[PDB]
Amino acid sequence: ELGLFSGTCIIVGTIIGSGIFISPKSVLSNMEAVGPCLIIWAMCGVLATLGALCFAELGTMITKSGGEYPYLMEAFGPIPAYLFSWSSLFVIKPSSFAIICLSFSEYVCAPFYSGCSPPQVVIKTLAAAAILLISTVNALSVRLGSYVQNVFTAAKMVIVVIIIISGLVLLAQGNTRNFENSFEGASLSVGSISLALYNGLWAYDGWNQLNYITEELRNPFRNLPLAIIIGIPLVTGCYILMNVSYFTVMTATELLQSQAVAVTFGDRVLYPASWIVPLFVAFSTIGAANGSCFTAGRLVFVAGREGHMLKVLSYISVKRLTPAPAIMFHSMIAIIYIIPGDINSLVNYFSFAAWLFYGLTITGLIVMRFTRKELKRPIKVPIFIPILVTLLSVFLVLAPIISAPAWEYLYCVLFMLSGLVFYFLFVHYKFGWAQKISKPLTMHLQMLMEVVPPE
Amino acid sequence: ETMVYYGLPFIQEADFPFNSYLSKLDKPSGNSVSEVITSWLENMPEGKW
Amino acid sequence: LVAAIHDKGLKLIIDFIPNHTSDKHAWFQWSRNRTGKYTDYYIWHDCNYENGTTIPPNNWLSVYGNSSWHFDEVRKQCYFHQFMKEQPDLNFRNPDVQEEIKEIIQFWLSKGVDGFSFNALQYLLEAKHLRDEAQVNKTQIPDTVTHYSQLHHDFTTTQVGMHDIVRSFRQTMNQYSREPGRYRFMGTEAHGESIT
Numbered sequence A: 001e002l003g004l005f006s007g008t009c010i011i012v013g014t015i016i017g018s019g020i021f022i023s024p025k026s027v028l029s030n031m032e033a034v035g036p037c038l039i040i041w042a043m044c045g046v047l048a049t050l051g052a053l054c055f056a057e058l059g060t061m062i063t064k065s066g067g068e069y070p071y072l073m074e075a076f077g078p079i080p081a082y083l084f085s086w087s088s089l090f091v092i093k094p095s096s097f098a099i100i101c102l103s104f105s106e107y108v109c110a111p112f113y114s115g116c117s118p119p120q121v122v123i124k125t126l127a128a129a130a131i132l133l134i135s136t137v138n139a140l141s142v143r144l145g146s147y148v149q150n151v152f153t154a155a156k157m158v159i160v161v162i163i164i165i166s167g168l169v170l171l172a173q174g175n176t177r178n179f180e181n182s183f184e185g186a187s188l189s190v191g192s193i194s195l196a197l198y199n200g201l202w203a204y205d206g207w208n209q210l211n212y213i214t215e216e217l218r219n220p221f222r223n224l225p226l227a228i229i230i231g232i233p234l235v236t237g238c239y240i241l242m243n244v245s246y247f248t249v250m251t252a253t254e255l256l257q258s259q260a261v262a263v264t265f266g267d268r269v270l271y272p273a274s275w276i277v278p279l280f281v282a283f284s285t286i287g288a289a290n291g292s293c294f295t296a297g298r299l300v301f302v303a304g305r306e307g308h309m310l311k312v313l314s315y316i317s318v319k320r321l322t323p324a325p326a327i328m329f330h331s332m333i334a335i336i337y338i339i340p341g342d343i344n345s346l347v348n349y350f351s352f353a354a355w356l357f358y359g360l361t362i363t364g365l366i367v368m369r370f371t372r373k374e375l376k377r378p379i380k381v382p383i384f385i386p387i388l389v390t391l392l393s394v395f396l397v398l399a400p401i402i403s404a405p406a407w408e409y410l411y412c413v414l415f416m417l418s419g420l421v422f423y424f425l426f427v428h429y430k431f432g433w434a435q436k437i438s439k440p441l442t443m444h445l446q447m448l449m450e451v452v453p454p455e
Numbered sequence B: 001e002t003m004v005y006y007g008l009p010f011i012q013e014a015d016f017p018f019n020s021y022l023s024k025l026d027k028p029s030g031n032s033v034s035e036v037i038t039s040w041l042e043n044m045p046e047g048k049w
Numbered sequence C: 001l002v003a004a005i006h007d008k009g010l011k012l013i014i015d016f017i018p019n020h021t022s023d024k025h026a027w028f029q030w031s032r033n034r035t036g037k038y039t040d041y042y043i044w045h046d047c048n049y050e051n052g053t054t055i056p057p058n059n060w061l062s063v064y065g066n067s068s069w070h071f072d073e074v075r076k077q078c079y080f081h082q083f084m085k086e087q088p089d090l091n092f093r094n095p096d097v098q099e100e101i102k103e104i105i106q107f108w109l110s111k112g113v114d115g116f117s118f119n120a121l122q123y124l125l126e127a128k129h130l131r132d133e134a135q136v137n138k139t140q141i142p143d144t145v146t147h148y149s150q151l152h153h154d155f156t157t158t159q160v161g162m163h164d165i166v167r168s169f170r171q172t173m174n175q176y177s178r179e180p181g182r183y184r185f186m187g188t189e190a191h192g193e194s195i196t
C-alpha cells in the first residue's frame, strides 16, 4: 500500500498544472501591484485547502463511487444532483478542457511570434487541433493514455524547480527593485478581488477530485487530512515561490504584455537554451488535458443509473474498452467553446458555474451534519472551516455578476436553467412521446459506433 | 591596407590576400627575409591563415 | 527616470558622441604627461613653437574655423581637434581607444537605456599621411585660409576604415538586444552635404 509520503506526492503533482503559467498575467492585471497579487496566491491557496478538507468528510461518510453527484443526492434531493450532472457535462468539464488546450497553443506559438502577440486564428486553429488529437488518442487506446502520463508529470515538475531555483539565485544577487515599493497602486475592490480570485483558484483546479486516493492509502482516516493539510499548503508555498520568481526577473508592466508568462522568463534568464520552457510547458499542459479526458466517462456512469443523463453515453466500444460516445461528445462541446471565447472569458465562465456547485456541496455538508443526517463520520472537521468555504464561495459567485457584469455569465445561467427545463419534460413527468425519441436514438448510435453497455 | 582583405570578425571577405612580399627580395640577406616573416605575422588579424 | 519610463511603456535613447573628449578628461591629463598606455589615446604631432606663434603640421582647419592643431605646453607637441580647442580628438586607430568606447556603450546599456544616437560620425578617422588639403580657390595665399569652407575636406571626413568602426559599435549593442522585446536602437546623424 501507499504510505504518507506517497500520500502527498500524488496530490501535489495533481494540483500544480498549467494554471501557474497562465494565471499570473490575469491576476496581476487586476491587482496592479506586485504586493497584493502575492497575497492572492496565498489567500486562494488557503481557500483551496479548506475546500479539499471538507471534501474529505463527504468522501468518507458517504463512501460511494460517484465523485460529487452523490453528495448532492444525499443532502438536497434529486434536482441539484441532476442540475450538477447537467452542468458538469455542458459547462464545467468541456470548458475546463477548452482552457487547457487554449493554454497549450499560447505556449507552442509564442516563440514563433517573438516580440508581439500571435493572431487569434493561430491560437485557435492550434487549440482545435489539440482537442481533436487528445480526444482521438484517448478513444482508440487506453495504454497510450497512461503511457505518456508519468513522463508528462516529470516535465511539469522539472520546470517548476528550474523557475524556482533560478528565481531564488537571482534574488541573492540583489535584483530587488520590483517588490521594493509594492502596494503603491493596489486597486482592491469587490470588482477586482473577485475577478482575481477566479484566475488564482483556476491554478488549484483538481482539489475536489482528491478522494479516490483513500482506497490505497495505508491508514486513510489518520493520514488523508494530514496529506491534504501538508500537501496543498506545500503547493501554495511553491506558487508564491514561483510567482516571486517572475517579478524578480521582469517588471509589472512587461507581465501584462505577454500571455505566455514563462516564455518571457526563459528568454531573459536561460538564453543559451531558452526553447526549453515552451517545450516543457507544452508537454505538461498536454498531459493535464489527458487527465481531463480520462475522467469524462466517470460521472456519466453514476448519473446513468438514476436515469438523469442518457444511458447511451456510458456505453463502451468492444474493440477497445474506451468510452467512445462520452469522449467524442465531451470534445465536440469544447470545439464550440474555443470559437467564441478566449482564455480570460472562459476562466470566468468556468470558475463561475463550478463555484456555485462547490458551494451547494459543502453547505450540504453542514446541513446534513446539522439536522438531517446523524450517521457516523470517520474524520470530522471543525465547524468553522465549512462556514468559511460557503461564505467565501457565496462571495465568489455573486460579486462578479453584480460588480463586473459580462455576457459570459448570462450564457452560463441560461445553460443550467435549460437543464432545469429538461428535468420536468424528460425525467420528472416521463411523457409518453418522450420515450419514443430516446429508444430509436440510443441503439442507432450503438449501431453506428459499435459501443456496448459496460455491464 | 592588405590586411583589410582578411575581413572583420563579423563581415567575411577573401580567405587570404596573396603575400607577394617574399617575391620582392633581390638580395638574400638574413634580416631581409626575417623582416618579411615578422611583418606579415604580426600585422595579420587573430584567427586568420 | 529609466525605471519610470519603462513602467509607462516608453523607451529611452540618449545622445552619444565618441569622437572627442574635453581637455579636462582624465585620459588627456595622463596623455600630455605621457603616462602609461594613454600616451597614444590622442593624436599628437611635432610642431615648431616659438614666440607664441605655431606652424601646424599641415593646413587642416577646424570645423569652427582656425588651424586644427594646437600646441600643448606640457607635452611640447601639437594635438588634433576638429572642433574648438577644448575638444581634442581621440585616436581611433589604436585598439586601446576602441575598447574604452566599447565599455561606455556597455555601461549605459546595462542601466536600461534602449539605444543611442551617434553624433559627429564622419569625423572619426583622419588620413594618416597628414598631407595638406586642396583649396577651393587654388590661387589663394596659403596663410589667409582660415575658414573651414575654403578647403576640400578629403582627408578629415569619411575616411576608408570609418564604417567598420561604426559596424563595431553595432556588434557591441547586439549582445544586449537578443532577448525579445529589448532590441537596442542605433541611429546616426546624416551628412549635411550628401544623401548617397
Ligand SMILES: *[C@@H]1O[C@H](CO)[C@@H](O[C@@H]2O[C@H](CO)[C@@H](O)[C@H](O)[C@H]2NC(C)=O)[C@H](O)[C@H]1NC(C)=O
Pocket (backbone or CB within 6 Å): C064, C065, C066, C146, C147
Ligand atoms: C581664429 O582665431 C582668431 C583669434 O586668435 C580669430 O580672430 C579674432 O576674431 C574676433 C572675432 O570676434 C575679433 O574680435 C578679434 O579681433 C580677432 N583677433 C585678431 C588678432 O584679429 C579669428 O577670427 C579665428 N578665425 C576664424 C573664426 O575663422
Ligand SMILES: *[C@@H]1O[C@H](CO)[C@@H](O[C@@H]2O[C@H](CO)[C@@H](O)[C@H](O)[C@H]2NC(C)=O)[C@H](O)[C@H]1NC(C)=O
Pocket (backbone or CB within 6 Å): C137, C138, C139, C140, C141
Ligand atoms: C581666388 O582668390 C584670388 C586671390 O588670391 C582672386 O584673384 C585676384 O586676387 C587679387 C589679389 O591682389 C585681387 O586684387 C583681384 O581682385 C582678384 N581677382 C578677382 C577678385 O576677380 C580670384 O579671383 C579668386 N577666385 C574666385 C573664384 O573667387
Ligand SMILES: CC(C)CCC[C@@H](C)[C@H]1CC[C@H]2[C@@H]3CC=C4C[C@@H](O)CC[C@]4(C)[C@H]3CC[C@]12C
Pocket (backbone or CB within 6 Å): A158, A161, A162, A165, A166, A167, A169, A170, A269, A270
Ligand atoms: C531538476 C533540475 C535541477 C535539473 C536542471 C539542472 C540545471 C540544468 C539547472 C539547475 C539550476 C540552474 C541554474 C539556476 C540559476 C541560474 C542563474 C541564471 O542567472 C543563469 C542560469 C543559472 C546558472 C541556471 C543554469 C541551469 C541550472 C544549473
Ligand SMILES: *[C@@H]1O[C@H](CO)[C@@H](O)[C@H](O)[C@H]1NC(C)=O
Pocket (backbone or CB within 6 Å): C029, C030, C033, C035
Ligand atoms: C603630470 O605631471 C606633473 C609633473 O610631475 C604632475 O604634477 C601632475 O600631477 C601630472 N598629472 C597627471 C594627470 O599625471
Ligand SMILES: *[C@@H]1O[C@H](CO)[C@@H](O)[C@H](O)[C@H]1NC(C)=O
Pocket (backbone or CB within 6 Å): C050, C051
Ligand atoms: C618673437 O616674437 C615677436 C613678437 O613681437 C615676433 O615679432 C617675432 O617674429 C618672434 N620671433 C621668432 C623667431 O619667432
Ligand SMILES: [Ca+2]
Pocket (backbone or CB within 6 Å): C019, C082, C089, C090, C123, C124, C125, C126
Ligand atoms: Ca577624429
